[PDB]
Design a protein around this ligand. Structure first.
Ligand SMILES: CCCCCCCC(=O)Nc1c(I)c(C(=O)O)c(I)c(C(=O)O)c1I
Ligand SMILES: CCCCCCCC(=O)Nc1c(I)c(C(=O)O)c(I)c(C(=O)O)c1I
Ligand SMILES: *C/C=C(C)/C=C/C=C(C)/C=C/C1=C(C)CCCC1(C)C
Ligand SMILES: CCCCCCCCCCCCCCCC
Ligand SMILES: CCCCCCCCCCCC
Ligand SMILES: CCCCCCCCCCCC
Ligand SMILES: CCCCCCCCCCCC
Ligand SMILES: CCCCCCCCCCCC
Ligand SMILES: CCCCCCCCCC
Ligand SMILES: CCCCCCCCCC
Ligand SMILES: CCCCCCCCCC
Ligand SMILES: CCCCCCCCC
Ligand SMILES: CCCCCCCCC
Ligand SMILES: CCCCCCC
Ligand SMILES: CCCCCCC
Length: 224
């Protein structure tokens, strides 16, 4: 498993991210700031667990398609199922989205992760991409709401909140956009990019989307 090295680096980075966020979060009195610490510390914690699992050889299965037996890390989806809605929740609390909007985003997010997982396990090569397409559409719905809906909500907040939302929004659009592409070209889809490089890419994306995101949010005045 040549990809072990990037599973190890991702473990170490998620672990350090979590530790740092926990230490800083434990020293914070502001009640608002605390909620953001709690949600955000959980994100790399969950990622650390799943990265550790995969490093130790769990959450990997073989799926036949295209006449080969292909290795699929399904533990990624167990991670993303819980971490992606928590990141959305961070953004929704920053802009005070309402409840129905939160429910719509969390549900689209569930569809995105669940259909992606189904696509990753599908044995008929062609139908894999049907699932991929549905998952991507759910994703684009989320991105639309974040870009159009949340930006409008953020503009009723003080500028320092609006500014922080924008940076986090822009990070999110750019980082989340790349995931369906990686999947399409990697070992789950077209099989062009081998598993090791793909594991590197998902590791860079995961650390950036979780620890990078967290560092921006948790160091800003916006959460106090
Ligand atoms: C791989 C992730 C790359 C995406 C970069 C996101 C940070 C950002 O929004 N930068 C930025 C900032 I900070 C700022 C800023 O300084 O507030 C602004 I204004 C803008 C803009 O709209 O031009 C931008 I773009
Ligand atoms: C990808 C990880 C690297 C990001 C490190 C900078 C994070 C940051 O919040 N910077 C920052 C600055 I510089 C500044 C600044 O201009 O000093 C401010 I004000 C805020 C804020 O409170 O909104 C923030 I958040
Ligand atoms: C920490 C992880 C983050 C922010 C992960 C985000 C992951 C996605 C946006 C994944 C999206 C996918 C698609 C849109 C289609 C193909 C399947 C996925 C699950 C890779
Ligand atoms: C008539 C208003 C609805 C228009 C629907 C747009 C559908 C396609 C959007 C998919 C892409 C959203 C990208 C988000 C920008 C970051
Ligand atoms: C109180 C705010 C700081 C973070 C709270 C902990 C949230 C759960 C993460 C525990 C990981 C070990
Ligand atoms: C008013 C809120 C409606 C929620 C819409 C969920 C959209 C699901 C994504 C479509 C993927 C096929
Ligand atoms: C294929 C992706 C569908 C995106 C459709 C956007 C729905 C409008 C919601 C309004 C929120 C700003
Ligand atoms: C079989 C090993 C050689 C192929 C290397 C493919 C790397 C493509 C990376 C594209 C990055 C997005
Ligand atoms: C063969 C070398 C094994 C080392 C494993 C270390 C991974 C943990 C992250 C620091
Ligand atoms: C600070 C890190 C807390 C997470 C430890 C949980 C380990 C679960 C093993 C799968
Ligand atoms: C496909 C790799 C995407 C590259 C962006 C990584 C930069 C992270 C800084 C927050
Ligand atoms: C001890 C700080 C850990 C943060 C990891 C940095 C990742 C930057 C993208
Ligand atoms: C969410 C609706 C599922 C439609 C899937 C069609 C299956 C084709 C293989
Ligand atoms: C070890 C470097 C981390 C800086 C945070 C304050 C100790
Ligand atoms: C990835 C860009 C970080 C900018 C932080 C400024 C608040």
């Amino acid at each position: 498993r040549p990809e072990w090295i990037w599973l190890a680096l991702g473990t170490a980075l998620m672990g350090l991210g979590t530790l740092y966020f926990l230490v800083k979060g434990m020293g914070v009195s502001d009640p608002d700031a605390k909620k953001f610490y709690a949600i955000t510390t959980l994100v790399p914690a969950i990622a650390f667990t799943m990265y550790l699992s995969m490093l130790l050889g769990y959450g990997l299965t073989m799926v036949p398609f295209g006449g080969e037996q292909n290795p699929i890390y399904w533990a990624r989806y167990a991670d993303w199922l819980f971490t992606t809605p928590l990141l959305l929740l961070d953004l929704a609390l920053l802009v005070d989205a309402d409840q129905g909007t939160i429910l719509a985003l969390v549900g689209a997010d569930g569809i995105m992760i669940g259909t992606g997982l189904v696509g990753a396990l599908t044995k008929v090569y062609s139908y894999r991409f049907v699932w991929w397409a549905i998952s991507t559409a759910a994703m684009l719905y989320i991105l639309y709401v974040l870009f159009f809906g949340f930006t409008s909500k953020a503009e009723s907040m003080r500028p320092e909140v609006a500014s922080t939302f924008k940076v986090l929004r822009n990070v999110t659009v750019v980082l989340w956009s790349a995931y369906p592409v990686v999947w399409l070209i990697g070992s789950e889809g077209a099989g062009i990019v081998p598993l090791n490089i793909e594991t590197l890419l998902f590791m860079v994306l995961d650390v950036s989307a979780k620890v990078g995101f967290g560092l921006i949010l948790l160091r800003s005045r916006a959460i106090f």
